[PDB]
Design an enzyme around this catalytic site. Sequence first.
Site, PDB file in Angstrom:
ATOM      1  N   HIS A  79     117.671 105.107  27.429  1.00 18.97           N
ATOM      2  CA  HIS A  79     118.636 105.965  28.157  1.00 18.97           C
ATOM      3  C   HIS A  79     118.149 106.764  29.262  1.00 18.97           C
ATOM      4  CE1 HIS A  79     121.506 105.152  24.356  1.00 18.97           C
ATOM      5  NE2 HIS A  79     121.348 103.995  24.980  1.00 18.97           N
ATOM      6  N   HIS A 238     127.993 100.176  28.740  1.00 14.61           N
ATOM      7  CA  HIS A 238     126.661 100.920  28.095  1.00 14.61           C
ATOM      8  C   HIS A 238     125.773  99.753  28.067  1.00 14.61           C
ATOM      9  CE1 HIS A 238     124.084 103.671  25.969  1.00 14.61           C
ATOM     10  NE2 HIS A 238     123.967 102.559  24.826  1.00 14.61           N
ATOM     11  N   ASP A 242     121.864  99.776  29.121  1.00 12.38           N
ATOM     12  CA  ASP A 242     120.746  99.384  28.341  1.00 12.38           C
ATOM     13  C   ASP A 242     120.111  98.336  29.038  1.00 12.38           C
ATOM     14  OD1 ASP A 242     120.970 101.243  26.198  1.00 12.38           O
ATOM     15  OD2 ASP A 242     122.078  99.963  24.788  1.00 12.38           O
ATOM     16  N   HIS A 265     118.413  94.324  23.553  1.00  8.61           N
ATOM     17  CA  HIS A 265     117.157  94.984  24.010  1.00  8.61           C
ATOM     18  C   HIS A 265     116.297  93.836  23.784  1.00  8.61           C
ATOM     19  CE1 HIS A 265     118.970  98.907  23.987  1.00  8.61           C
ATOM     20  NE2 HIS A 265     119.177  98.707  22.932  1.00  8.61           N
TER      21      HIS A 265
END
Length: 300
Positions: A79, A238, A242, A265
Amino acid sequence: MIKQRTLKRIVQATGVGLHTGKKVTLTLRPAPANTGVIYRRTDLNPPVDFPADAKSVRDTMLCTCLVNEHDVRISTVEHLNAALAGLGIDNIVIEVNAPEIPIMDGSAAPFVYLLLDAGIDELNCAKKFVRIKETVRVEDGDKWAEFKPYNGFSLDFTIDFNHPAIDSSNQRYAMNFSADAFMRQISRARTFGFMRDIEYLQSRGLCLGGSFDCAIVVDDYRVLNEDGLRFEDEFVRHKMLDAIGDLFMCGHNIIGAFTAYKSGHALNNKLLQAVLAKQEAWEYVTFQDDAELPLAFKAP
Ligand SMILES: C[C@H](O)[C@H](NC(=O)c1ccc(C#CC#Cc2ccc(N)cc2)cc1)C(=O)N=O
Ligand SMILES: C#Cc1ccc(C(=O)N[C@H](C(=O)N=O)[C@@H](C)O)cc1
Ligand SMILES: [Zn+2]
């Protein structure tokens, strides 16, 4: 000439770690040209450096972490990393007296103000961009992510959620990146989790920093946070936060078109390494001439 940037001054902030629940002091420092992004643990003696690198990333159950050659870790970097990309920071030393970056409110926004406090210093050395010049695609089951040639930086993200508290018309977000667009449309979107899972982790002594103050939490049916959502599509916003953080692990802004379906991720990082691994799929470019600089990567 479009120059590399660093901080003007040293700044500090405190907050709790998502894992330990303990107070962590975060220190940001200016750094010379070409040294890149360095995460550093000062709780260990001697201190340990973790150069931001796509190969050093591991997608742990909670957020992400970097590892060194001995598998020592620094966690929850993505972040803050996203904020670095947003504000165009190229060289910086990031120190924590703990095994992790503080979670803050679950978003990137608190890091924005911190960086603004530190200021900008341009270094007399050209800033290098990674220009995509071949389509590159990676897959994992029904999930995929690709980069395509494009004189700019755009992200097109679709998430597969079936949760009653997440409506379908809020399962895709797309933007043309820019410092201003990141700060206003992305930086405040918080991370999110399932309440029962969190309860479980905390009963096993994990995720001890987890609270309503650092995440959107839903049960089977609804958002539990008193004030609800900052955006109707905060979840997917969000996920894009990411993505920007994951992609900037290479330490360079990428000129190209990012598209992802059900990515995370692991997949984002798999794409990043796939791109960099193929020599002809990309190239470094600089901008001696500032007017050449794509709209997307102009100063804030
Ligand atoms: C979205 C990504 O997958 C991912 N999120 C996490 O891994 C994640 C998200 C949320 C939490 C949490 C929490 C909590 C809590 C709480 C505890 C007690 C009480 N009373 C109320 C709330 C942890 C990790 C992430 O954003 N990665 O960058
Ligand atoms: C540690 C840990 C841990 C990690 C992941 C899960 C999990 O997959 N939970 C499931 C769920 O559907 N969550 O939304 C179901 C089981 O609720 C559960 C525990
Ligand atoms: Zn996140």
